[PDB]
């Protein structure tokens, strides 16, 4: 049980291929499908400590109610791990086979999806092979941890140029900020005396970096408009044993103390009850079901050799936004029906179980027509149809079962 399930692959021919089956298997499973989702992503350069940090996100996700979740100092780091099989820089994006169910403060039993997004952001594998995944995971995440080395550099901000172009359009269309949280995680920070480790120091740091000369890095002037939350955490260097090694055999004892001290505040600061942010688009809390719709949409857009036109992107999330309002209606109805005549439920009367259908179907039609939909009036007629012929095919399956 549990492990990385490479979902979105980027093959040698600029082709983004999405393995739907594995994806449905995880997100569609009957335990989670209906719970609202928190989609946490860590993006950024390969070989910068991502896997490492993620294995520690797991140590916490599992052993969440126990102070010593960091593990046994005099034993070798031994959790599930994300670095399981990396024979190469397979530059796509994997997610954690197991979802996690947790209770936020106010009560909602929400679900938590972790996604490691590999890329390079370096050589020629960038044009359509880096800000492509990064683009991807951002769109669908609710929390993006942008894992950087030593400093937020001009070239790091450059990769956001895309998101601010798209976000500006989504904002015009929707009147809401496009994205949720963006967390700048700076690793091996080594000017404690200039800005303290952790979030407070990070906040002052990130304020200085983002102010305002410089080229077309007026990503500066628009980021903020795009995310409801940008924030920053300054992590220490892990000591030389960790940094000097391909695979890190040693024990927790061998990691630097001031790194452990801050990692211990870092992980709960990101995950954990109050910190979690439910995925939200055009005002609509996405669910685990709903979120498969977005994956599906954002993946037939990143096909070809050209990153998409911000205009096509917007249209991708409109299709998804629409396909999701449909998916809930074909479930609001479905659940209400399973009450009037499901399981060992009684009754009958065709002439009667018809009006309770036209009833609930009309109720469910409003539910849809009302959901703030994006795309526009005509664009979503296509989906009003899709809806009705699914509630109707669901009806049939109830007439059949009703007969007794
Ligand atoms: N300097 C430094 N090295 C790290 C840190 N975390 C992990 N490493 C090491 O640097 C390499 C990065 O490995 P990994 O976590 O797989 O990075 P990823 O492939 O980008 O996810 C590993 O050999 C680690 O032992 C860090 O915070 N700072
Ligand atoms: Mg990795």
Swiss-Prot record:
Residue ranges of every copy of the GB1/RHD3-type G domain listed in the record: 34-275
Disease: Spastic paraplegia 3, autosomal dominant: A form of spastic paraplegia, a neurodegenerative disorder characterized by a slow, gradual, progressive weakness and spasticity of the lower limbs. Rate of progression and the severity of symptoms are quite variable. Initial symptoms may include difficulty with balance, weakness and stiffness in the legs, muscle spasms, and dragging the toes when walking. In some forms of the disorder, bladder symptoms (such as incontinence) may appear, or the weakness and stiffness may spread to other parts of the body.
Superkingdom classification of source: Eukaryota
Subcellular location: Endoplasmic reticulum membrane; Golgi apparatus membrane; Cell projection, Axon
Effect of residue 161 to R: Abolishes homodimerization
Complex and partners: Monomeric and homodimeric. The homodimer, transiently formed by two molecules on opposing membranes, is the active form mediating ER membrane fusion. Interacts with REEP1, REEP5, RTN3 and RTN4 (via the transmembrane region); these proteins are involved in endoplasmic reticulum tubular network organization. Interacts with ZFYVE27; both proteins are involved in endoplasmic reticulum tubular network organization. Interacts with ARL6IP1; both proteins are involved in endoplasmic reticulum tubular network organization.
Residues binding Mg(2+): 51
Impact after mutating residue 209 to C: In SPG3; decreased GTPase-dependent fusogenic activity; changed endoplasmic reticulum tubular network organization; endoplasmic reticulum and Golgi morphology are affected
EC number in record: 3.6.5.-
Binding site for GTP: 47-52, 187-188, 242
Residues bearing PTM N6-acetyllysine: 361
Membrane-related topology note: Multi-pass membrane protein
Amino acids binding GDP: 47-52, 118, 187-188, 242, 245
Function: Atlastin-1 (ATL1) is a membrane-anchored GTPase that mediates the GTP-dependent fusion of endoplasmic reticulum (ER) membranes, maintaining the continuous ER network. It facilitates the formation of three-way junctions where ER tubules intersect. Two atlastin-1 on neighboring ER tubules bind GTP and form loose homodimers through the GB1/RHD3-type G domains and 3HB regions. Upon GTP hydrolysis, the 3HB regions tighten, pulling the membranes together to drive their fusion. After fusion, the homodimer disassembles upon release of inorganic phosphate (Pi).
Effect after changing residue 321 to K: In HSN1D; the mutant protein has decreased GTPase activity compared to wild-type and causes disruption of endoplasmic reticulum network morphology
Effect after changing residue 131 to P: In SPG3; changed endoplasmic reticulum tubular network organization; endoplasmic reticulum and Golgi morphology are affected
Outcome, altering residue 187 to Q: In SPG3; loss of GTP-binding; loss of homodimerization; loss of GTPase-dependent fusogenic activity; changed endoplasmic reticulum tubular network membrane organization
Residues on Cytoplasmic side: 1-404
Protein name: Atlastin-1
Shown stretch of the complete protein: 31 to 438 of 558
Catalytic activity annotation: GTP + H2O = GDP + phosphate + H(+)
Tissue expression pattern: Expressed predominantly in the adult and fetal central nervous system. Measurable expression in all tissues examined, although expression in adult brain is at least 50-fold higher than in other tissues. Detected predominantly in pyramidal neurons in the cerebral cortex and the hippocampus of the brain. Expressed in upper and lower motor neurons (at protein level).
Positions of region (3HB (three-helix bundle) domain): 313-404
GO terms, biological process: axonogenesis; endoplasmic reticulum membrane fusion; endoplasmic reticulum organization; endoplasmic reticulum tubular network membrane organization; protein homooligomerization
Gene Ontology terms: cellular component: axon; endoplasmic reticulum; endoplasmic reticulum membrane; endoplasmic reticulum tubular network; endoplasmic reticulum tubular network membrane; Golgi apparatus; Golgi cis cisterna membrane; Golgi membrane
Enzyme class: hydrolase
């Amino acid at each position: 049980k549990a492990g990385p399930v490479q979902v979105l692959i980027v093959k040698d021919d600029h082709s983004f291929e999405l393995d739907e089956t594995a994806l449905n298997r995880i997100l569609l499973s009957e335990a989670v499908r209906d719970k609202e989702v928190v989609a946490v992503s860590v993006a950024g350069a390969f070989r910068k400590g991502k896997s490492f940090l993620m294995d520690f996100m797991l140590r916490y996700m599992y052993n969440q109610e126990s102070v010593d979740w960091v593990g046994d100092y005099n034993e070798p780091l031994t959790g599930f791990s994300w670095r399981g099989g990396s024979e190469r820089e397979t530059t796509g994006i994997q997610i954690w086979s197991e979802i996690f169910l947790i209770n936020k403060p106010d009560g909602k039993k929400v679900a938590v999806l972790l996604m490691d997004t590999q890329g390079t952001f370096d050589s020629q594998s960038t044009l359509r092979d880096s800000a492509t995944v990064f683009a991807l995971s951002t769109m669908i995440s609710s929390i993006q941890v942008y894992n950087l080395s030593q400093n937020v550099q001009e070239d790091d901000l450059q990769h956001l140029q895309l998101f601010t172009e798209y976000g500006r359009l989504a904002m015009e269309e929707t009147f809401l900020k496009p994205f949720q949280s963006l967390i700048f995680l700076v690793r091996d920070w080594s000017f404690p005396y200039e800005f303290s480790y952790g979030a407070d120091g990070g906040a002052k740091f990130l304020e200085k970096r983002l102010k305002v000369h410089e080229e077309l890095q007026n990503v500066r002037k628009h980021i903020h408009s795009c995310f409801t939350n940008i924030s920053c955490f300054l992590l220490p260097h892990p000591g030389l044993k960790v940094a000097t090694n391909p695979n890190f055999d040693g024990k927790l004892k061998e990691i630097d103390d001031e790194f452990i001290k801050n990692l211990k505040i870092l992980i709960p600061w990101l995950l954990s009850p109050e910190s979690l942010d439910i995925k939200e688009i055009n005002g609509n809390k996405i669910t685990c079901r709903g979120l498969v719709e977005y994956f599906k949409a954002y993946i037939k857009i990143y096909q070809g050799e050209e990153l998409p036109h911000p205009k096509s992107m917007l249209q991708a999330t409109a299709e998804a936004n629409n396909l999701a309002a449909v998916a809930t209606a074909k479930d609001t109805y479905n659940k209400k029906m399973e009450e009037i005549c499901g399981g060992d439920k009684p009754f009958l009367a065709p002439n009667d179980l018809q009006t309770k259908h036209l009833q609930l179907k009309e109720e469910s039609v409003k539910l849809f027509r009302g959901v703030k939909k994006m795309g526009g009036e005509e664009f979503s007629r296509r989906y009003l149809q899709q809806l009705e012929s699914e509630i109707d095919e669901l009806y049939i399956q109830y007439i059949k079962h009703n007969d007794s």
